Design a binder for this molecule. Structure first.
Ligand SMILES: CCCCCCCCCCCCCC(=O)O
Length: 211
């Protein structure tokens, strides 16, 4: 793999953002995190066993997911989030995938704290046939309230190193499956640090492997 995806399903763009109330007047959004793969060296690898404890146990945990396979569909994304941006704006998440196959997708996003699942969001999205390939658009999903509240608290911490200590215990697991066949298509584990404002958001993608 040279990016986040397989031959069956590719991530095109992913982002989490806030538009301030003013946006109606002069548009603007702040990206907390953001992946853009609008384009065509193999990724680095990380053994999945090192991150087992950072995600839930039993059904829906990394070990049982990896065991069910397929192994090539598992990725780890490290985000340096930009928490420099404010009261009543719109907080949103947007995702877009592509495949050659027409499918109906189920996307499950699990927020975990100290490796225990804290909240879950499950969504389905049917293929739209555009330009020989199929596109899946989950755009402008309102950010769930736990996460907006978490962000507002985090941003007020007096020191970056304490934000990093707190974020050390906060992870997100995304499982995309073929809603009709139950086949897993993509599983992405996210881990987080804060960036330094002068540096906006950045990320690094790894393949999750298993010796
Ligand atoms: C430290 C800020 C965390 C970054 C904001 C979340 C970005 C990762 C994906 C969030 C998707 C979760 C879907 C949801 O639960 O609303």
């Amino acid at each position: 793999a040279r990016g986040l995806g397989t031959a069956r399903l590719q991530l095109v763009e992913f982002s989490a953002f806030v538009e301030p109330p003013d946006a109606v007047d002069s548009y603007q959004r702040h990206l907390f995190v953001h992946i853009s793969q609008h384009c065509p060296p193999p990724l680095e690898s990380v053994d999945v066993r090192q991150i087992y404890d950072k995600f839930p146990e039993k059904k829906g945990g990394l070990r049982e997911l990896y065991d069910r396979g397929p192994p090539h569909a598992f990725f780890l994304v490290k985000f340096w989030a930009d928490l420099n941006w404010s009261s009543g704006g719109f907080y949103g998440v947007s995702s877009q995938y592509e495949s050659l196959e027409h499918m109906t997708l189920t996307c499950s996003s699990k927020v975990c704290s100290f490796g225990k699942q804290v909240v879950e969001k499950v969504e389905t999205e049917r293929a739209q046939l555009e330009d020989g390939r199929f596109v899946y658009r989950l755009l402008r999903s309102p950010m769930c309230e736990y996460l907006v509240n978490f962000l507002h608290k985090l941003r007020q911490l007096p020191e970056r190193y304490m934000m990093n200590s707190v974020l050390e215990n906060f992870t997100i697991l995304q499982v995309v499956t073929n809603r009709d066949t139950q086949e897993l298509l993509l599983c992405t584990a996210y881990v987080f640090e804060v960036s330094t404002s002068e540096r906006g958001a950045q990320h690094h993608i790894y393949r999750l492997v298993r010796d």
